[PDB]
């Protein structure tokens, strides 16, 4: 069903911790068959299961952490601040995102965007 | 003009201060004469400065901080995580929210949006 507010949050934290695993198999299955994602937002977004895994093939030595709460809205919406450590060409480098989500009526990611850009980015 | 990402930055750090000393009229100017607000998301918004201002009355001894970077794109885009510490009834209680704001050609806030709900309220 769309999640609760209780739900959302549930979601969202289960989702970093799959990002930080690194699985991306179950990364993808969490969005919706058609869902869109916007990563850095004000790029065009990519469709469909087939696109996002390819994204996060090519992202994902990496780990990401919750840096606050989620926070959840009562009609499937999500908002949650975290930080994604990493190493850009041997240098080591983190960046701190802010990723929003809207789930459907069967607790999937309909859309994703993701708030950062270089100022963002402390390589 | 259209903020970039590192003007962003400071305009929504800007407008924490602001809500933190509680400065209502600096606060209703840094939004678009047309603004609307989604307070929490979810609600219908607000239009305007008239019902901000009054929804910023109604609303603010009360402390606001960043917890955490602003994150911006380059789109006139922002989304920032905080801290509201009030005091409900003689208690005490926190909510961590999430605003999204979209700037306009001018660097006034066009859009704005909470997100929270009570999951978030440590009361």
Redesign the interface.
């Given at each position: 069903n769309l999640p609760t507010?209780?739900e959302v949050?549930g979601l969202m934290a289960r989702y970093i911790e799959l990002v930080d695993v690194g699985d991306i198999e179950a990364i993808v299955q969490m969005y919706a068959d058609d869902a869109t994602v916007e990563d850095?937002?004000?790029q065009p977004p990519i469709h469909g299961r087939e696109q996002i895994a390819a994204f996060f093939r090519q992202g994902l030595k990496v780990r990401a952490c919750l840096?606050?709460?989620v926070?959840?809205?009562?009609?499937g919406?999500?908002?949650?601040?975290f930080r994604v450590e990493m190493v850009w060409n041997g240098q080591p480098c983190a960046l701190?995102?802010?990723d929003?989500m809207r789930f459907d009526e069967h607790g999937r990611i309909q859309t994703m965007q993701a708030?950062?850009?270089?100022?963002?980015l402390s390589v």
């Open positions: 507010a209780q949050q850095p937002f004000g840096t606050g709460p926070r959840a809205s009562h009609n919406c999500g908002a949650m601040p701190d995102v802010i929003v708030y950062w850009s270089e100022v963002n």
